[PDB]
DNA sequence: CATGGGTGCGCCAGACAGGG
DNA sequence: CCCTGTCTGGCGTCCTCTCACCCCATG
């Protein structure tokens, strides 16, 4: 829901879900053209922490 | 109309779709002017060892419903009787008893 | 710029349907040549009606297919989608050649 | 011999990290210890001394290397590096047009209002450089003329 | 325009080492 | 293995009434 002004005051769970989906899309891209082990280990580790 | 003679028609379209349009090339240009030696003469021999079916001249074009061999109509696929009973029903689009 | 050639069996349908195919164009493209009729193909099949002898009783049939042209003027992307993608009237052929 | 290593930067400031890295090299004049810098990850041709490691982590807006450990960080275990490089080359490479086409051949549209649709080329015109293909719009294959580059061979 | 990158609390309690 | 020290977690009163302010930043 927005506030008086109009800027949407967004919840915290939308930040959490949007982070997990951004990282998951990056990791899938790192499965198609993909990239070396160290890269996908950091990518999966950032998804795990997300 | 003689269900065996319907079954004899359906096996002839299969053989015409397996051999010919693919083995009509032996008569297409290998019966045309080239090295017209025994290479040509072998090919004129080599299409009789195909079945006596599988040529499109063996196909009769019977009716799609009744299988009646005479009175066929190659716009609809029916005989002249089965096109008339259908048209007066309204099974065939844009057709009517017309006069000019 | 784009020939719109459309075919159907009914004349009251193909000519009704050509009114909105320019109303979906002149609303946006705002320039069409005009509704051009085309000479109709009348295919006749006169054939016997009895299942045996009496080959003098035949019934004359005729299937009339009509053709119309509007040949829209303006090739602006808006008009293109408003005709190519927006095809209406089932039972009416319409074929386009840009 | 200089082997490759992976550097993590603040994602978005990556070109500025690369420029600051080249400048820190030419400041602390370990010129014989750095080969290149390739572009959120920055590829560095390098050798491993602890001095050069402190140099790269003292470059601003750099988090650290990515490897097995932080004592002796890890060079390059190429697994999909070649695939990524090939994809980038093809993208930034000359896109071959779909000139080869024949009647009954399916094609793909990626231009105009027919974008994201497939169809077949009933007629072809090499002289007019135009393909006659119809695209199923509301089911009705709308025969339209598209250029070889306007559509892709299917 | 759109995304992503301090250093003043105190007790209980059980799990994890660490001697012992 | 039997006791001893450490290391992290879990927790701490209820209703109300105003106020002020909520992501830069930028090629």
Swiss-Prot record, chain A:
Modified how: Acetylated on several lysine residues in the presence of glucose.
Applications (biotechnology): Co-administration of salinamide and rifampicin or salinamide and myxopyronin suppresses the emergence of resistance to both antibiotics.
Family: Belongs to the RNA polymerase beta' chain family.
Self-association state and partner proteins as the record states: The RNAP catalytic core consists of 2 alpha, 1 beta, 1 beta' and 1 omega subunit. When a sigma factor is associated with the core the holoenzyme is formed, which can initiate transcription. The rRNA transcription and antitermination complex (rrnTAC) consists of RNAP, NusA, NusB, NusE (rpsJ), NusG, SubB, ribosomal protein S4, DNA and precursor rRNA; S4 is more flexible than other subunits.
Function recorded in the entry: DNA-dependent RNA polymerase (RNAP) catalyzes the transcription of DNA into RNA using the four ribonucleoside triphosphates as substrates. Resistance to the antibiotics salinamide A, salinamide B, rifampicin, streptolydigin, CBR703, myxopyronin, and lipiarmycin can result from mutations in this protein.
Listed name of the protein: DNA-directed RNA polymerase subunit beta'
From Swiss-Prot, chain B:
Disulfide feature: none
GO cellular component: cytoplasm; cytosolic small ribosomal subunit; small ribosomal subunit
Residues in the signal sequence: none
InterPro entries per the UniProt record, alphabetical: Ribosomal_uS14 (IPR001209), Ribosomal_uS14_bac/plastid (IPR023036), Ribosomal_uS14_CS (IPR018271)
One GO BP: ribosomal small subunit assembly
Record-linked Pfam families: Ribosomal_S14
UniProt entry keywords in alphabetical sequence: Ribonucleoprotein, Ribosomal protein
Gene Ontology molecular function: any one: tRNA binding
Keyword Transmembrane helix: no
Coiled coil: none
Family from the record: Belongs to the universal ribosomal protein uS14 family.
Function, as annotated: Binds 16S rRNA, required for the assembly of 30S particles and may also be responsible for determining the conformation of the 16S rRNA at the A site.
Assembly and oligomerization: Part of the 30S ribosomal subunit. Contacts proteins S3 and S10.
NCBIfam families in the cross-refs: PRK08881.1
Protein name as it appears in the record: Small ribosomal subunit protein uS14
Organism: Escherichia coli (strain K12)
From Swiss-Prot, chain C:
Cellular component, GO, one term: small ribosomal subunit
Disulfide links within the chain: none
InterPro entries: Ribosomal_uS10, Ribosomal_uS10_CS, Ribosomal_uS10_dom, Ribosomal_uS10_dom_sf
Keywords: Ribonucleoprotein, Ribosomal protein, Ribosome biogenesis, RNA-binding, Transcription, Transcription antitermination, Transcription regulation
GO terms, molecular function: structural constituent of ribosome; transcription antitermination factor activity, RNA binding; tRNA binding
A biological process from GO: transcription antitermination
Superkingdom per UniProt: Bacteria
Family note: Belongs to the universal ribosomal protein uS10 family.
NCBIfam families: PRK00596.1 (NF001861), rpsJ_bact (TIGR01049)
Matching HAMAP family: Ribosomal_uS10 (MF_00508)
Protein name per its UniProtKB record: Small ribosomal subunit protein uS10
Organism: Escherichia coli (strain K12)
Organism taxonomic ancestry: Bacteria, Pseudomonadati, Pseudomonadota, Gammaproteobacteria, Enterobacterales
Protein's gene: rpsJ
From Swiss-Prot, chain D:
Keyword Transcription: yes
GO CC annotations on file: cytosol; transcription elongation factor complex
Key words, A-Z: Ribosome biogenesis, Transcription, Transcription antitermination, Transcription regulation, Transcription termination
Domain KOW: 103-134
InterPro entries recorded: KOW, NGN, NGN-like_dom, NGN_dom_sf, NusG-like, Rib_uL2_dom2, Transcrpt_antiterm_NusG, Transcrpt_antiterm_NusG_bac_CS
Entry's Gene Ontology BP terms: DNA-templated transcription termination; regulation of DNA-templated transcription elongation; ribosome biogenesis; transcription antitermination; transcription elongation-coupled chromatin remodeling
Pfam families assigned to the protein according to its UniProt record, in alphabetical order: KOW (PF00467), NusG (PF02357)
Superkingdom of this protein's organism: Bacteria
Database matches in Gene3D superfamilies: 2.30.30.30, NusG, N-terminal domain
PROSITE patterns: NUSG
Keyword Cell membrane included in the entry's annotation: no
Job of this protein: Part of the processive rRNA transcription and antitermination complex (rrnTAC). The complex forms an RNA-chaperone ring around the RNA exit tunnel of RNA polymerase (RNAP). It supports rapid transcription and antitermination of rRNA operons, cotranscriptional rRNA folding, and annealing of distal rRNA regions to allow correct ribosome biogenesis. Participates in transcription elongation, termination and antitermination. In the absence of Rho, increases the rate of transcription elongation by the RNAP, probably by partially suppressing pausing.
Stated family: Belongs to the NusG family.
Classification via NCBIfam families: nusG
Matching HAMAP family: NusG
Protein name in UniProt: Transcription termination/antitermination protein NusG
Organism: Escherichia coli (strain K12)
Gene designation per UniProt: nusG
